[PDB]
Amino acid sequence: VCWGELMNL
Amino acid sequence: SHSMRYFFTSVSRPGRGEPRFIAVGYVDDTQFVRFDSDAASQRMEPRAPWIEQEGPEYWDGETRKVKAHSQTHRVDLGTLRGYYNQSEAGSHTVQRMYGCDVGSDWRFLRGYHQYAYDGKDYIALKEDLRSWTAADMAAQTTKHKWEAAHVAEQLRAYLEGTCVEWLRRYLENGKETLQRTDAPKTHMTHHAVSDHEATLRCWALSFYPAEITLTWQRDGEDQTQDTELVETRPAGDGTFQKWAAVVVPSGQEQRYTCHVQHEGLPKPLTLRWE
Amino acid sequence: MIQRTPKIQVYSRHPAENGKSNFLNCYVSGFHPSDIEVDLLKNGERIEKVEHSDLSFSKDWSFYLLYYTEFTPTEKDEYACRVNHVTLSQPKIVKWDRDM
């Protein structure tokens, strides 16, 4: 599965 | 050793509406999931037989998360447009890749997570999984923001935990295809290009995984400077192909030998003309 | 901005035999940006029954795509791949060579 926690550049 | 890899590409389309978003997932050299923003599906889709097993929770979850990826990249395009003081009338590209490698003991070996903007390194997680490599000033801004928010911690938590877990799961479920090794079927072709010259081409076919080395030697001397080496290409059936060619003076064929290295071969293979 | 020219390979999945069905492949790799036009040609005409892989890229951020279709090789039918990309001043044709 992929990463669920994302943060903008 | 094995690997799980997620690739994401977002391309802005000035005037044409929202950017094109494409996501793909790989176990080693085998794709298993995909997402296309312009498709009617709007779902994470299977691309491997062994991932179709997963229940509705899996697909719903991965769909939601990949959509989140699309949104984040969508914002990233504008943000970066701000960072570089760029116009709103040019197409730009954001690429993200991340994933993990496990060793023979099926335990965490390596982890990675990197961003590129317009074909160029933007920001990357270092091997220690707790610091960032930023190629320019904007990426340094990004670095400040991520350091203040402790992104590397959560990221490391994913890479060392979830990523490895699901890598082992997928490796188990698709063991028939993922835990296989297909030795290259090798041969050499000879074709006169002129009255005095001949093309010697060394072929490796039907091999898995894609990693392979083909080298030409002339009387034991390596000929990389004068070898045409094509990019390893997919056959379409899950196996790969590659060839290397040299143009030689007619009559010197016996001086040239091809050398093939692949993990499917019990030992390196040498092909020759006599 | 950076631009990378697509490397084009045209080839069959299995060794070609006349009258025996096979797969025609046009693999394009190492290009940037991702916007690209790829067509499989039979005797100069665009083959409509062509599928392609999902957009992915290599370690150096350069993109790769596989375009493919079923085809039964014959003596007279000439196959090729036509590629247009920003790095190309004009569409590039790479002919299928079964004898390499």
Q: Which two tokens stand for residue B62?
A: 């991965």
Q: Which two tokens stand for residue B165?
A: 């877990």
Closest CB from B9, B241, B243 relative to C34: B9
Provide the CATH number for the domain around residue C18.
2.60.40.10
Chains with ≥3 Cβ pairs under 8 A against B?
A, C
Asked if B201 is an interface residue toward chain C (Cβ–Cβ < 8 A), one would say yes
Judge whether C57 and B7 are in contact, CB under 8 Å: yes
Judge whether B37 and B13 are in contact, CB under 8 Å: no
What DSSP state is assigned to residue B86?
-
Q: How many residues does chain B have?
A: 274
Which residue matches tokens 């690997």? Answer: B3
Resolution (A): 2.0
Domain count, chain C: 1
Can you give the residue range of the structural domain that contains C46? 1-100
Interchain CB contacts (distance < 8 Å): B and C:
77
Query: Which residues, numbered 109 to 138 in chain B, qualify as contacts with chain A under a Cβ-Cβ cut-off of 8 Å?
Result: 115, 122-123
Helix ranges (DSSP H) in B22-178:
56-83, 137-149, 151-157, 163-173, 175-178
Distance between CA atoms of residues B11 and B48, nearest Å: 26
Method of structure determination:
X-ray
* Structural domains in chain B plus CATH codes: 1-180 (3.30.500.10), 181-269 (2.60.40.10)
